[PDB]
Amino acid sequence: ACSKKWEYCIVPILGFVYCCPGLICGPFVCV
């Protein structure tokens, strides 16, 4: 599932989630 911008998403250097096309995960959220 794609994470929403002002939602929640962590990007650990081993495995991370993915936002919807257009948004990119950042500081435990998406932008």
UniProtKB/Swiss-Prot annotation:
Q: Which positions form S-S bridges?
A: 2-20, 9-25, 19-30
Q: Which domain of life is it from?
A: Eukaryota
Q: Where in the cell is it found?
A: Secreted
Q: In which tissues is it expressed?
A: Expressed by the venom duct.
Domain commentary: The presence of a 'disulfide through disulfide knot' structurally defines this protein as a knottin.
Give the function comment from the record. Answer: MuO-conotoxins are gating-modifier toxins that inhibit sodium current by trapping the domain II voltage sensor in the closed position to prevent opening of the sodium channel. This toxin has a preference for Nav1.4/SCN4A over Nav1.2/SCN2A sodium channels. It blocks Nav channels by interacting mainly with the C-terminal part of the pore loop of domain-3. It also blocks fast-inactivating calcium current. Blocks Nav1.8/SCN10A sodium channels and has potent and long-lasting local anesthetic effects.
**What family is this?**
Belongs to the conotoxin O1 superfamily.
Miscellaneous remark of the record:
This peptide was under preclinical trial by Cognetix Inc under the name CGX-1002 as a local anesthetic agent.
Q: What is this protein called?
A: Mu-conotoxin MrVIB
Full-protein residues shown:
52 to 82 of 82
